[PDB]
Design an enzyme around this catalytic site. Structure first.
Site, PDB file in Angstrom:
ATOM      1  N   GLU A  43       0.810  -1.245   0.000  1.00  0.00           N
ATOM      2  CA  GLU A  43       0.000   0.000   0.000  1.00  0.00           C
ATOM      3  C   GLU A  43       0.844   1.297   0.000  1.00  0.00           C
ATOM      4  OE1 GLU A  43      -3.136   0.254  -0.693  1.00  0.00           O
ATOM      5  OE2 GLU A  43      -3.850  -1.778  -0.297  1.00  0.00           O
ATOM      6  N   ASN A  79      -7.985   8.243  -6.217  1.00  0.00           N
ATOM      7  CA  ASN A  79      -8.687   7.191  -6.962  1.00  0.00           C
ATOM      8  C   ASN A  79      -9.510   7.775  -8.085  1.00  0.00           C
ATOM      9  OD1 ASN A  79      -8.130   4.578  -5.469  1.00  0.00           O
ATOM     10  ND2 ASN A  79      -8.755   5.929  -3.793  1.00  0.00           N
ATOM     11  N   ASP A 139     -12.665   7.546  -8.957  1.00  0.00           N
ATOM     12  CA  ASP A 139     -13.941   8.085  -8.546  1.00  0.00           C
ATOM     13  C   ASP A 139     -13.786   9.412  -7.801  1.00  0.00           C
ATOM     14  OD1 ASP A 139     -13.214   7.465  -5.833  1.00  0.00           O
ATOM     15  OD2 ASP A 139     -14.320   5.602  -5.860  1.00  0.00           O
ATOM     16  N   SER A 184     -12.259   9.935  -4.830  1.00  0.00           N
ATOM     17  CA  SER A 184     -11.866   9.780  -3.442  1.00  0.00           C
ATOM     18  C   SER A 184     -10.331   9.709  -3.334  1.00  0.00           C
ATOM     19  CB  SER A 184     -12.525   8.551  -2.826  1.00  0.00           C
ATOM     20  OG  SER A 184     -12.009   7.388  -3.395  1.00  0.00           O
ATOM     21  N   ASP A 204      -6.874   7.901  -1.054  1.00  0.00           N
ATOM     22  CA  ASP A 204      -6.329   6.909  -0.102  1.00  0.00           C
ATOM     23  C   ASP A 204      -5.247   7.559   0.753  1.00  0.00           C
ATOM     24  OD1 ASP A 204      -7.962   4.885  -1.317  1.00  0.00           O
ATOM     25  OD2 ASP A 204      -6.315   3.987  -2.355  1.00  0.00           O
ATOM     26  N   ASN A 257      -9.363   4.888   2.689  1.00  0.00           N
ATOM     27  CA  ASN A 257     -10.057   5.657   1.671  1.00  0.00           C
ATOM     28  C   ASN A 257     -11.113   6.649   2.216  1.00  0.00           C
ATOM     29  OD1 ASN A 257     -12.628   5.320  -0.358  1.00  0.00           O
ATOM     30  ND2 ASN A 257     -10.711   5.757  -1.471  1.00  0.00           N
ATOM     31  N   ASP A 262     -15.734  -5.279   8.548  1.00  0.00           N
ATOM     32  CA  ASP A 262     -16.888  -4.846   7.742  1.00  0.00           C
ATOM     33  C   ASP A 262     -17.551  -5.936   6.873  1.00  0.00           C
ATOM     34  OD1 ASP A 262     -18.366  -2.302   6.650  1.00  0.00           O
ATOM     35  OD2 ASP A 262     -17.506  -3.206   4.820  1.00  0.00           O
TER      36      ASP A 262
END
EC number: 3.2.1.17
Length: 129
Positions: free
Chosen positions: A35, A46, A48, A50, A52, A59, A101
């Site tokens: 990462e 990203n 879209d 957003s 990180d 995110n 999650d």
């Protein structure tokens, strides 16, 4: 801050990640490696829109507030900034929620693609733990 490999494994362990939700320490260190390369100040945009953040590239769409991701959530109730400090507490606490999650560590695409089913114990070889 750019952590050492064993230096990160130790801080992760002190923070309760070793075997959290069944994921041994080598998984978390492997994921951090791919990462952020162990750099707490890593950010990545990203498609879209957003972003990180930090050691585990958490995110802004679901997990943190950066005030620039339309329609997103802040389920870890932190500013995304907090994910870039030298102190990894916020990143660890927020990873605990993500990993709980429903998808385990699959929530991290680089973990699934690069760590899953590999000999992850390699990542903690020779560390004083």
């Amino acid at each position: 801050k750019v952590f050492g490999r064993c230096e990160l494994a130790a801080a992760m362990k002190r923070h309760g990640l070793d075997n959290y939700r069944g994921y041994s320490l080598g998984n978390w260190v492997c994921a951090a490696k791919f990462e952020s390369n162990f750099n707490t100040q890593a950010t990545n945009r990203n498609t879209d829109g957003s972003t990180d953040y930090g050691i585990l590239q958490i995110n802004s769409r679901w997990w943190c507030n950066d005030g620039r991701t339309p329609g997103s959530r802040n389920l870890c109730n932190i500013p995304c900034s907090a994910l870039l400090s030298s102190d990894i507490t916020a990143s660890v606490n927020c990873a605990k929620k993500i990993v709980s999650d429903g998808n385990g560590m699959n929530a991290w695409v680089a973990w699934r693609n690069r760590c899953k089913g590999t000999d992850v114990q390699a990542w903690i070889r020779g560390c004083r733990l």
